[PDB]
Amino acid sequence: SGQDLVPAAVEQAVPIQPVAGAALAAPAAGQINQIDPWIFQNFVQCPLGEFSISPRNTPGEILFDLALGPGLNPYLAHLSAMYTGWVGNMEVQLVLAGNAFTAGKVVVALVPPYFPKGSLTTAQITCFPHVMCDVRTLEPIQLPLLDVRRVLWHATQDQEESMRLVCMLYTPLRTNSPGDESFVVSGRLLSKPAADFNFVYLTPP
Amino acid sequence: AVPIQPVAGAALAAPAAGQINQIDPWIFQNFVQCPLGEFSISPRNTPGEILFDLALGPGLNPYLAHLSAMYTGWVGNMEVQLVLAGNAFTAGKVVVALVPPYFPKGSLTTAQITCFPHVMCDVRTLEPIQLPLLDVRRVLWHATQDQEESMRLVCMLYTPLRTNSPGDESFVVSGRLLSKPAADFNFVYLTPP
Amino acid sequence: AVPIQPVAGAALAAPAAGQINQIDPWIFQNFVQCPLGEFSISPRNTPGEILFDLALGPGLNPYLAHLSAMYTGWVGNMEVQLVLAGNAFTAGKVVVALVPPYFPKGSLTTAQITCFPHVMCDVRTLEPIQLPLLDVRRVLWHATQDQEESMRLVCMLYTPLRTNSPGDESFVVSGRLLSKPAADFNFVYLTPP
Amino acid sequence: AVPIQPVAGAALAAPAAGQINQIDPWIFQNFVQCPLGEFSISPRNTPGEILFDLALGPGLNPYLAHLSAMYTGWVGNMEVQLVLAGNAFTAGKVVVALVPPYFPKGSLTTAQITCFPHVMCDVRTLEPIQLPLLDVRRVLWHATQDQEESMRLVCMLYTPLRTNSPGDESFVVSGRLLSKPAADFNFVYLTPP
Amino acid sequence: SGQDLVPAAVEQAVPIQPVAGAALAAPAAGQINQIDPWIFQNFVQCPLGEFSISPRNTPGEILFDLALGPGLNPYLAHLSAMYTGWVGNMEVQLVLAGNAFTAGKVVVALVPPYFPKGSLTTAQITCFPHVMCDVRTLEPIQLPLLDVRRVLWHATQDQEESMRLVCMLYTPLRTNSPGDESFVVSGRLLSKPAADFNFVYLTPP
Numbered sequence: 002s003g004q005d006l007v008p009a010a011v012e013q014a015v016p017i018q019p020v021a022g023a024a025l026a027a028p029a030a031g032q033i034n035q036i037d038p039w040i041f042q043n044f045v046q047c048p049l050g051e052f053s054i055s056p057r058n059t060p061g062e063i064l065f066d067l068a069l070g071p072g073l074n075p076y077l078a079h080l081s082a083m084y085t086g087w088v089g090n091m092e093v094q095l096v097l098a099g100n101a102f103t104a105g106k107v108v109v110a111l112v113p114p115y116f117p118k119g120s121l122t123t124a125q126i127t128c129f130p131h132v133m134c135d136v137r138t139l140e141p142i143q144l145p146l147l148d149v150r151r152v153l154w155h156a157t158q159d160q161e162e163s164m165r166l167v168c169m170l171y172t173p174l175r176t177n178s179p180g181d182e183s184f185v186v187s188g189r190l191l192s193k194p195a196a197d198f199n200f201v202y203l204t205p206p
Numbered sequence: 207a208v209p210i211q212p213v214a215g216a217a218l219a220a221p222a223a224g225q226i227n228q229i230d231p232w233i234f235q236n237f238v239q240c241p242l243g244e245f246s247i248s249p250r251n252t253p254g255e256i257l258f259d260l261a262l263g264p265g266l267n268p269y270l271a272h273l274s275a276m277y278t279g280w281v282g283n284m285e286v287q288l289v290l291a292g293n294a295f296t297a298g299k300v301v302v303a304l305v306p307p308y309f310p311k312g313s314l315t316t317a318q319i320t321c322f323p324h325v326m327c328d329v330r331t332l333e334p335i336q337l338p339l340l341d342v343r344r345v346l347w348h349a350t351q352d353q354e355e356s357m358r359l360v361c362m363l364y365t366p367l368r369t370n371s372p373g374d375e376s377f378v379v380s381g382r383l384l385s386k387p388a389a390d391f392n393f394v395y396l397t398p399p
Numbered sequence: 400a401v402p403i404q405p406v407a408g409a410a411l412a413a414p415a416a417g418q419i420n421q422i423d424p425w426i427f428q429n430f431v432q433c434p435l436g437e438f439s440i441s442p443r444n445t446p447g448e449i450l451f452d453l454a455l456g457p458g459l460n461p462y463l464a465h466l467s468a469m470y471t472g473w474v475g476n477m478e479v480q481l482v483l484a485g486n487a488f489t490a491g492k493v494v495v496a497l498v499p500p501y502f503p504k505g506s507l508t509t510a511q512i513t514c515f516p517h518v519m520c521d522v523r524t525l526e527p528i529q530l531p532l533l534d535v536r537r538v539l540w541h542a543t544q545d546q547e548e549s550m551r552l553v554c555m556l557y558t559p560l561r562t563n564s565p566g567d568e569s570f571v572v573s574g575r576l577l578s579k580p581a582a583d584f585n586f587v588y589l590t591p592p
Numbered sequence: 593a594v595p596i597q598p599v600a601g602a603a604l605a606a607p608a609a610g611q612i613n614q615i616d617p618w619i620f621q622n623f624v625q626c627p628l629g630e631f632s633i634s635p636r637n638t639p640g641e642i643l644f645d646l647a648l649g650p651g652l653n654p655y656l657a658h659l660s661a662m663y664t665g666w667v668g669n670m671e672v673q674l675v676l677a678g679n680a681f682t683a684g685k686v687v688v689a690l691v692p693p694y695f696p697k698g699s700l701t702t703a704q705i706t707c708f709p710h711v712m713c714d715v716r717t718l719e720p721i722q723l724p725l726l727d728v729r730r731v732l733w734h735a736t737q738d739q740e741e742s743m744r745l746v747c748m749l750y751t752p753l754r755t756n757s758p759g760d761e762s763f764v765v766s767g768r769l770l771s772k773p774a775a776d777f778n779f780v781y782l783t784p785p
Numbered sequence: 786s787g788q789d790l791v792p793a794a795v796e797q798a799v800p801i802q803p804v805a806g807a808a809l810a811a812p813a814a815g816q817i818n819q820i821d822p823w824i825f826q827n828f829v830q831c832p833l834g835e836f837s838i839s840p841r842n843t844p845g846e847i848l849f850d851l852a853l854g855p856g857l858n859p860y861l862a863h864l865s866a867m868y869t870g871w872v873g874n875m876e877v878q879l880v881l882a883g884n885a886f887t888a889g890k891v892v893v894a895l896v897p898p899y900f901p902k903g904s905l906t907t908a909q910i911t912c913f914p915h916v917m918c919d920v921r922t923l924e925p926i927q928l929p930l931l932d933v934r935r936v937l938w939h940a941t942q943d944q945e946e947s948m949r950l951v952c953m954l955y956t957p958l959r960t961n962s963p964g965d966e967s968f969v970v971s972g973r974l975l976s977k978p979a980a981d982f983n984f985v986y987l988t989p990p
Contacts, residue, residue, distance in 0.1 A: 002718045003680030005487035005787030007525050016428035021221035042595040045706045056568065075707055098714065100683040100754050104484045104572065113224065113278050113395045115349050127432045127577065128398035128461055130224075133482065133527075139714070149224040149395070151279065151346045172484045172573035179963035181565045184683070184754045187639070191706065230420045232589055268591050269469060276462060396425055398461050402826040446971070487787030490884040490968070513829045513975065514859055521882065521923070525786045561884050561968045 005101060010138035015111065015130040020147040022089035022197025026154040030086070030201045040076050041194055044094050044141075047073050050190030054105070054136065056174045056183045061123040064107065064168040064188065069146050071157065073192045081157050086201025088154045091194055093166070094141035097134065099186040105174040108133045113149055114162040126169045133171065136186055145195065154201055208304065208323045213340050215282045215390030219347040227277060227393040233269055234387055237287060240266045243383030247298065247329075248376045249367045254316055257300070257361040257381065262307075262339050264350060266385050274350040275399045281347045282391030284339040286359065290329055292379045298329045299365035300381075305358040307342055319362045326364065329379060338388065347394055359383075401497065401516045406533050408475045408583030412540040420470060420586040426462055427580055430480060433459045436576030440491065440522075441569045442560045447509055450493070450554040450574065455500075455532050457543060459578050467543040468592045474540045475584030477532040479552065483522055485572045491522045492558035493574075498551040500535055512555045519557065522572060531581065540587055552576075594690065594709045599726050601668045601776030605733040613663060613779040619655055620773055623673060626652045629769030633684065633715075634762045635753045640702055643686070643747040643767065648693075648725050650736060652771050660736040661785045667733045668777030670725040672745065676715055678765045684715045685751035686767075691744040693728055705748045712750065715765060724774065733780055745769075789885060794922035799895065799914040804931040806873035806981025810938040814870070814985045824860050825978055828878050828925075831857050834974030838889070838920065840958045840967045845907040848891065848952040848972065853930050855941065857976045865941050870985025872938045875978055877950070878925035881918065883970040889958040892917045897933055898946040910953045917955065920970055929979065938985055 049072075052064050071077035071087055081087065095109065110129040112121075127133075134142050146166050155161045176183040216226050243266075245257035264270035264280055274280065288302065303322040320326070327335050342357050361381075371377040409419050436459075438450035457463035457473055467473065481495065496515040513519070520528050535550050554574075564570040602612050629652075631643035650656035650666055660666065674688065689708040706712070713721050728743050747767075757763040833856075836848050855861035855871055865871065879893065894913040896905075911917075918926050930950050939945045960967040 002716050003787075005680075005789065007786075009525055014428075016425055017224045018226075020224060025221060039595055043706075043709065046703050048703065051702075060573075075703065096685070096751070098683060098685060098751065101681050102486055102488070104486050104489075104570075106482065106484045106573075111224075113397060115278060115351060116397060124432060124434070125398040125461070127430065128396070130429065135484070137486070147224060148222075150222050151219075151349070153346075172575065173571075175484075175568065175570045175572075176565065177486050177488050177562050177570055178565050178756065179563050179966075182756060183565060183567075186754075187751050189751065225425050227423045227425055230589070232418050232420055236589075269589070272469060272592050276465060396423070396429075396462070399465050402823055487789075488885050490882060492880070492882060509835075510830050510832065510859065513827075516827065523786050558880070558882065558971050558973065561970075563962065563966060 003101060006137040006139055007135045008139045010134060010140055010142045012143070013132060015132060015144070017111065017130050017147060020090060020149060022148060022195065023199035024197070026088045026201065029153050032203065034084070034200050034203065036080060036198070036200060041196070044191035044193050045075060047190045047192055048075060048078060052188050054170065054174050054186045054188065056176065058170055058174060060170055060173055062170045063121070064170060065190065066165055066167050068163040068165050069148060070155070070163055074194065077194065080200065082206040083204060084200035084202060085157055085204050086154045087157060087199070088148055089195055089198030090145055090147045091192055091198065092143060092145055094143050094191040095134065096141050096189040096191065097136050097138055097186060099136040100184045101137070102176050102178045103136055103174060103184060103186060104177065105136045106133060106171045107136065108169050108171040109144065110167045110169070111146070112165040112167055114164055121167060123169055123171070126167060136174065141191065208325060208337070210304070210323050210340055213283065213342055215341065216392040219281045219394065222346050223279065223394045225395050227396065229273070229387060229391060237384035237386050238267055238269070240383050240385050245361065245381045246378040247363060247367050248378045249369060250376065251363055251366065253363045253366045255363040256314070257363060258383065259358055259360045261358045262341060262356040267387070270387065273393065276396060277350055277393035278397050279347040279349055279394030280392065281341060283341050283388035284385050284391070285336070285388045286339050286383060286385040287334040287336045289334045289382045289384065290331065290379060292329045294330055296330050296367065296369045296379060298367040299326060300329060301326045301362045301364040302337065303360045303362065304340065305360050307355045307357045314362065316362065316364055319360070329367070401518060401530070403497070403516050403533055406476065406535055408534065409585040412474045412587065415539050416472065416587045418588050420589065422466070422580060422584060430577035430579050431460055431462070433576050433578050438554065438574045439571040440556060440560050441571045442562060443569065444556055444559065446556045446559045448556040449507070450556060451576065452551055452553045454551045455534060455549040460580070463580065466586065469589060470543055470586035471590050472540040472542055472587030473585065474534060476534050476581035477578050477584070478529070478581045479532050479576060479578040480527040480529045481520070482527045482575045482577065483524065483572060485522045487523055489523050489560065489562045489572060491560040492519060493522060494519045494555045494557040495530065496553045496555065497533065498553050500548045500550045507555065509555065509557055512553070522560070594711060594723070596690070596709050596726055599669065599728055601727065602778040605667045605780065608732050609665065609780045611781050613782065615659070615773060615777060623770035623772050624653055624655070626769050626771050631747065631767045632764040633749060633753050634764045635755060636762065637749055637752065639749045639752045641749040642700070643749060644769065645744055645746045647744045648727060648742040653773070656773065659779065662782060663736055663779035664783050665733040665735055665780030666778065667727060669727050669774035670771050670777070671722070671774045672725050672769060672771040673720040673722045674713070675720045675768045675770065676717065676765060678715045680716055682716050682753065682755045682765060684753040685712060686715060687712045687748045687750040688723065689746045689748065690726065691746050693741045693743045700748065702748065702750055705746070715753070787885060790921040790923055791919045792923045794918060794924055794926045796927070797916060799916060799928070801895065801914050801931060804874060804933060806932060806979065807983035808981070810872045810985065813937050816987065818868070818984050818987065820864060820982070820984060825980070828975035828977050829859060831974045831976055832859060832862060836972050838954065838958050838970045838972065840960065842954055842958060844954055844957055846954045847905070848954060849974065850949055850951050852947040852949050853932060854939070854947055858978065861978065864984065866990040867988060868984035868986060869941055869988050870938045871941060871983070872932055873979055873982030874929055874931045875976055875982065876927060876929055878927050878975040879918065880925050880973040880975065881920050881922055881970060883920040884968045885921070886960050886962045887920055887958060887968060887970060888961065889920045890917060890955045891920065892953050892955040893928065894951045894953070895930070896949040896951055898948055905951060907953055907955070910951060920958065925975065
């Protein structure tokens with residue numbers, strides 16, 4: 002177990018203040034709905050939480066872009082068939098455990114609602130609350146994805162403007178290996194609801 | 207004394223916004239002129255003329271409109287004042303109303319403009335008339351890159367102008383509208399322009 | 400520990416400016432990327448390559464460049480950090496120098512770049528390298544609508560890269576430069592854009 | 593820290609069993625190798641390979657399997673540890689899951705193996721990984737001469753191996769699984785073999 | 786940032802006792818001359834402070850040999866045009882930051898005045914106050930170069946016998962890399978005046 006990596010993926014400060022979850026949507030919903038408490042314990046992989054970084058990728062290549070919601074959890078995506086509504090923050094891990102020979106850096110940003118989708122150049126991704134992380138960090142980089150909004154809750158009809166989470170490839174991936182091989186790093190993505198996630202109204206699945 | 211409650215500014219958006227950004231404190235110290243916030247009454251105008259009508263937002267200010275390019279949202283009240291240039295021998299009255307952020311559009315007669323929370327100011331008043339522009343809304347905060355319906359300020363000719371004129375000109379009375387952000391104007395989220 | 404005294408920010412402009420305007424406090428909390436503040440070293444580069452050179456001002460920031468459209472002047476220090484992407488088997492050193500706001504232009508050899516107040520950082524260092532960008536000047540404050548000479552940050556290849564590469568690519572080491580305003584960055588005078 | 597409650601061992605069988613028989617105390621002091629508890633990863637393996645899958649019982653131990661010939665039943669947890677032989681330059685991750693004693697059979701993708709109470713261990717970890725094998729059940733005690741469904745330990749390739757190899761061999765990483773009875777393993781009833 | 790190098794380049798004891806600098810030359814000079822105090826702060830590169838070690842070098846190859854004086858500083862070499870005289874010690878750094886695969890050792894000696902110049906075999910370089918340092922040491926090895934003399938000061942006419950600083954290649958440079966490449970280490974040399982450096986008499990440049 003060599004420690005020539007960068008395990009310096011400790012909790013960094015992201016310039017964002019805490020956000021209310023289910024406390025505001027309680028007096029406008031119609032009933033008391035809580036979800037299973039063992040769901041909040043373990044990090045599980047997103048339904049779209051696998052990607053890879055090849056050395057044939059140029060800086061600016063969006064590794065993943067995903068909106069906050071129940072589509073980031075296999076347990077929440079199954080429960081979101083019975084409800085019409087959700088509020089709360091979620092917590093995401095980032096498993097970039099590349100080989101001891103690679104080199105490179107990705108930057109995970111926190112894009113607000115109502116930002117125009119699409120290009121999102123690499124010069125304008127550091128303008129958001131971001132986390133700049135290497136591709137060798139052993140421990141899974143935890144980071145919060147918050148529910149910034151201007152309504153009381155979101156319907157489970159994906160057309161709502163929700164906060165995104167963009168992962169640009171800030172610098173190109175290179176390998177320093179003595180011969181013939183350039184390792185491809187396979188990144189995974191785990192998530193779990195924060196303490197204030199909750200669904201709103203019971204409807205037939 | 208207009209019959210309206212105070213409306214919460216950043217106290218309602220704060221639990222949901224991710225940032226709440228302050229404005230330069232030297233901006234609240236100046237009155238700037240609103241676009242399309244100018245008019246003039248000639249003694250040919252019959253009572254009922256809508257002299258102006260303009261909506262609440264960051265587009266009422268040269269500085270706020272420029273700053274709204276970095277931020278995602280905004281909440282807050284504004285503070286408008288009205289100047290009129292008329293001497294001591296004029297006679298005529300103007301009603302300024304605060305139209306809620308719905309009640310879409312139509313012909314408003316004088317019998318109807320006095321049914322809003324309003325201020326009925328004469329035309330020979332010396333000091334600029336101050337009044338608030340309140341942020342009534344149904345959402346937590348507004349979005350800067352989306353013009354949605356907000357409270358409007360409306361001006362009506364209530365009592366027609368009665369003055370003299372030598373032979374020229376018709377002696378119009380000019381009116382201008384200035385504004386500045388109230389104490390609890392805030393933006394929301396730093397984004398790239 | 401670079402050998403330079405602290406330089407006064409708004410404490411020198413204040414008696415002469417008419418306003419001293421503050422910036423959003425959420426702006427000092429983020430590092431944004433400077434234009435042209437990126438480079439890469441290939442093992443083909445011989446020591447002496449100027450990797451970048453960029454001047455102090457409000458044009459080092461997407462937000463500051465946008466805000467400088469309302470204001471007349473600016474004073475203050477900046478705070479830059481340097482990120483490098485290299486593993487534990489690389490070898491090579493880079494010197495970052497602080498060039499005074501004169502000393503115009505020419506070829507700078509390595510024997511000369513170490514004669515400035517500088518930081519000599521290796522290439523396998525993990526944490527981003529922090530350093531200040533000081534506002535040395537001869538006037539009380541600078542003007543936003545006039546680019547005059549300010550202190551520059553210069554990057555030089557001091558010791559050449561010594562690494563491996565399988566057959567492709569040449570394993571360049573990438574470098575990026577981020578910045579944010581220091582504690583005493585200020586604008587001066589509210590003007591219309 | 594796996595998200596499971598502790599499960600009662602002999603405290604649940606005791607009111608109904610006729611005897612509760614202890615095991616040699618020198619048996620809990622040793623880790624013995626489970627049959628079929630061995631595997632190897634080659635860089636040709638794509639993520640999703642079930643490296644092993646084995647059930648809880650007295651058949652995980654050379655001594656327990658021999659002692660179960662005298663006794664009628666058994667209850668208790670086990671204690672397994674996992675050894676992996678890989679150096680400091682490897683890269684790849686393995687998830688070990690605790691499958692409940694139903695949920696019969698099928699193809700388990702990686703998106704599904706992380707939904708169990710699990711441990712996600714890297715491949716360059718030095719010390720043997722310890723974890724429990726809990727006795728979840730619906731009956732008071734199990735019968736030694738009847739193989740019924742118990743909790744299973746499952747191993748999956750989560751992130752594929754990324755290493756080097758000179759020309760031979762393919763540098764597989766070997767993995768072995770050892771086990772020993774926990775504190776509350778018990779048999780039930782002395783019968784003739 | 787791997788730490789399989791030898792950062793063991795901490796301050797070693799060299800068998801030499803402290804030496805007077807400008808305190809003896811003060812009552813025989815003619816005036817009060819002090820040099821700028823910011824010069825004493827930063828280490829800058831010598832006018833002859835670059836060399837390289839190739840694996841095609843045999844033990845005994847003199848990497849550099851330089852005498853103590855104002856020729857070890859770009860700031861002092863410029864000031865030494867106005868003065869006729871100098872006394873004091875100086876401090877030298879040694880930037881040998883080779884790759885994690887090399888191997889070898891150099892030995893920096895402190896040769897006194899009046900030693901016959903030239904050959905200086907490798908068997909007779911450990912006979913002096915020496916520092917034996919590896920070629921992987923990260924932190925720049927600091928070491929003093931003192932003003933041992935038998936006069937009160939030295940003229941800035943280089944014919945004076947001053948104390949030298951020899952760098953032999955004690956062991957040959959090798960590389961342990963898996964294939965085809967032998968890295969060449971590029972050594973640098975920085976220096977700065979000690980607390981007792983001073984010039985003597987003002988003359989036209």
